[PDB]
């Protein structure tokens, strides 16, 4: 599963984390300490 | 002689690869209507391992049930769209057979 | 700094896990399966697959 | 590439082929005048001797076509093995490479914020 | 030759029509009621106009034969031939009037003239009613 | 899974982009984050900038009203 | 003239529903 | 018609049948502590594989480390020899005497027909396996020599910038 995500290039991957949180929310709008965060949950 | 219902479910599976087949047991209503046809397709998917899948004779039909499982979560609908939806997949969906099987 | 920024880039651009996960599950894939059971099915569809050229 | 056997296969059904050919033109020729007609089978018959040498240096030159099988099996086995120690080393290969190319960026990105905070020391 | 003209051009005239109701309702906005009320009455009623001008012709049309052209090649447009050969109805309708017969389900025959004389009776009833009061 | 690096290239790439161009002394005060790059003028806005490519130019990401 | 031709409305995707029945011999 | 009905036995399994597999193979295997049809829900029960191993179809029978060669060659090579011989001698045949020519003619085909008797024997899926065995795996050498190039390229101009910023110092 995460060779796909691994093997794109940041030029399609832009497009997916667009499409992944909808109209409105900017590709660079996600803060890295909010990032951590939902790693933390999603680990859990 | 009278054959075993090994030769019959397998004769079955290797003829629901005909798109023809599939459009005609589509067409009529209570084939899909009837939850007695979906149970027996969802019980035939244990042939997807060894030593049944040795043998089959098309594995073309491994993924036509398979696609015939999602068509339970998809909708009938969908039945006009069969022979130019399996005509123009047919090339990834032989090579993820092939992925799946000459690897 | 600019032309050693794009010599990492082309060089993160070759792959890191996702690898060597599919080289395992080609592994795995390889010892679950016998070889006699894939030659005799290979054999069977050697007939069907293959399009003979005198097949009008 | 194309494997032999299919070439082997190829070579036998034109030289099949060249036999039907030479001996139709066998059948409906015989009575043409006889010094062509002694020509064309000249060179029919130098088509059939070099048919067959191509078939000849085919048959022979099939890897594993004086060899046992079974020792193909070990070396087929031991080439997996041999296969499977040579990504592992992959796998040490590209996880060093990976340590020193973000060694790289961690002295990349160092070096950065020293030009920055020195040029805007002033 | 005369009679299928007439009914291409008013069959296409209402295929026109059917094509014009189609991209005003497709917007994502829909109209005022007006005009769509004068949308539709125009287009039935020009349904109804092609029902009764391909009613007049019958006999033309029948006399017709159906012969594919020597110069059309069949090889490559066997699917388009079919796809016009074809006349089976939709499954839909052929289910909906077998159960609408089977919820209808000598004496047919004298069932037939006793509703023959109802009929003749409520007209002849609604003819006084309205003889009754004047409406003028 | 990559998001982090590339949020962390992108901040890279702002931070030299925006050491390529002398930035005017009212707008000395600059913060880096999340690919993002913050100017807040007091009491009058803080924009928040970004770019994809080193040679493409900056373009608008955000923008704050004080 | 012709105010304007009518579009392509062709189905192709059409299923079609012609009965098959006398195959066997 | 022209598709053949459904198997009988599909119809018997509904939902309840399913549900209620589990306690009915349970109450079988209790009890069992051709096989005949007492109750409906008996064939979801798997099917057991026959003790001959054999499955007949259409008047058709069906049923380790890659998971004298010479004889055969040299016995190939005396066969197309006589071939090639017999070629000679039927055309001979049909040169002076053709009205028995036919005499030789299938001769000279059993001896072709031996020689696909001899390509039975020494039917190839091994050699398949080989051929595609190493053109993987010289993509994948070459792969991984393109890599070691490149990377060694790299720290090379690495190492040069280095020794010219040092010099520059």
Redesign the interface.
């Given at each position: 599963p995460?060779?796909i995500?691994?093997?794109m290039?940041?030029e399609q991957?832009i497009p997916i984390?667009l499409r992944q949180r909808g109209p409105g929310f900017?590709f660079?709008?996600?803060?890295?300490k909010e990032?951590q965060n939902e790693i933390k949950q999603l680990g859990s | 002689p009278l054959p075993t219902r090994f030769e019959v479910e397998l004769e079955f599976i290797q003829s629901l690869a005909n798109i023809q087949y599939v459009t005609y047991l589509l067409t009529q209503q209570q084939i899909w209507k009837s939850p007695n046809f979906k149970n027996y397709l969802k019980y035939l998917e244990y042939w997807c391992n060894p030593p049944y899948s040795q043998c089959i004779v098309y594995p073309n039909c491994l993924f036509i049930l398979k696609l015939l499982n999602g068509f339970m979560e998809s909708a009938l609908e969908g039945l006009d769209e069969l022979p130019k939806i399996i005509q123009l997949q047919g090339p990834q969906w032989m090579n993820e057979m092939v992925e799946r099987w000459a690897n | 700094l600019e032309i050693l920024n794009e010599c990492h880039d082309e060089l993160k651009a070759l792959p890191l896990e996702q690898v060597e996960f599919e080289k395992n599950t080609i592994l795995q894939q390889r010892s679950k399966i016998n070889s006699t059971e894939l030659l005799d099915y290979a054999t069977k569809l050697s007939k069907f697959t293959k399009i003979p050229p005198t097949f009008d | 590439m194309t494997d032999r056997l299919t070439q082997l296969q190829i070579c036998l059904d034109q030289m099949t082929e060249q036999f039907c050919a030479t001996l139709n033109y066998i059948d409906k020729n015989h009575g043409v005048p006889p010094e062509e007609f002694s020509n064309t089978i000249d060179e029919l018959s130098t088509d059939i001797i070099l048919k067959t040498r191509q078939i000849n240096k085919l048959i022979d030159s099939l890897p594993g076509v004086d060899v046992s099988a079974e020792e193909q099996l070990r070396k087929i086995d031991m080439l997996q093995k041999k296969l499977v120690e040579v990504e592992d080393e992959k796998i040490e290969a590209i996880k060093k490479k990976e340590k020193l190319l973000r060694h790289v960026d961690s002295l990349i990105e160092d070096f950065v914020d020293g030009i920055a905070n020195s040029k805007k020391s002033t | 030759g005369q009679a299928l003209d007439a009914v291409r051009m008013r069959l296409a005239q209402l295929t026109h029509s059917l094509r014009r109701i189609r991209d005003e309702m497709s917007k994502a906005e829909l109209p005022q009621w007006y005009t769509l009320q004068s949308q539709l009455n125009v287009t039935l009623s020009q349904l109804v106009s092609v029902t009764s001008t391909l009613q007049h012709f019958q006999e033309t049309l029948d006399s017709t034969v159906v012969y594919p052209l020597p110069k059309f090649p069949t090889t490559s447009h066997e699917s388009l031939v079919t796809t016009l050969l074809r006349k089976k109805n939709i499954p839909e309708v052929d289910e909906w009037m077998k159960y609408v017969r089977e919820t209808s389900g000598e004496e047919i025959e004298k069932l037939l003239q006793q509703d023959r004389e109802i009929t003749n009776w409520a007209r002849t009833t609604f003819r006084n009613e309205y003889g009754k009061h004047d409406f003028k | 899974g990559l998001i982090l690096q590339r949020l962390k290239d992108l901040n890279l790439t702002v931070s030299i982009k925006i050491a390529l161009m002398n930035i005017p002394k009212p707008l000395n005060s600059y913060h880096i984050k999340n690919g993002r790059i913050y100017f807040t003028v007091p009491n009058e806005f803080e924009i928040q900038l970004s770019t994809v490519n080193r040679q493409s130019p900056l373009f608008f990401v955000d923008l704050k009203l004080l | 003239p012709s105010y304007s031709p009518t579009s392509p409305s062709y189905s192709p995707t059409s299923p079609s529903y012609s009965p098959t029945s006398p195959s066997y011999s | 018609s022209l598709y053949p009905p459904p198997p009988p036995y599909v119809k018997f399994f509904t939902q309840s049948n399913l549900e209620k597999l589990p306690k009915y193979k349970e109450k079988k295997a209790a009890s069992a502590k051709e096989e005949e049809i007492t109750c409906a829900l008996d064939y979801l029960i798997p099917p057991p594989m026959p003790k001959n191993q054999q499955y007949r179809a259409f008047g058709s029978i069906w049923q380790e480390n890659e998971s004298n060669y010479q004889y055969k060659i040299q016995e190939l090579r005396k066969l197309l020899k006589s071939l090639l011989l017999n070629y000679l001698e039927l055309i001979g045949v049909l040169s002076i005497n053709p009205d028995m020519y036919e005499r030789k003619v299938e001769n000279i085909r059993t001896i072709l027909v031996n020689i696909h008797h001899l390509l039975n024997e020494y039917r190839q899926s091994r050699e398949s396996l080989i051929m595609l065995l190493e053109e993987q795996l010289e993509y994948k050498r070459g792969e991984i020599r393109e890599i070691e190039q490149v990377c060694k390229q790299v720290h090379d101009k690495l190492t040069s910038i280095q020794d010219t910023l040092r010099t520059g110092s």
């Open positions: 995460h060779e995500y691994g093997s290039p940041l991957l984390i900017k660079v709008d996600l803060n890295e990032l | - | - | - | - | - | - | -």
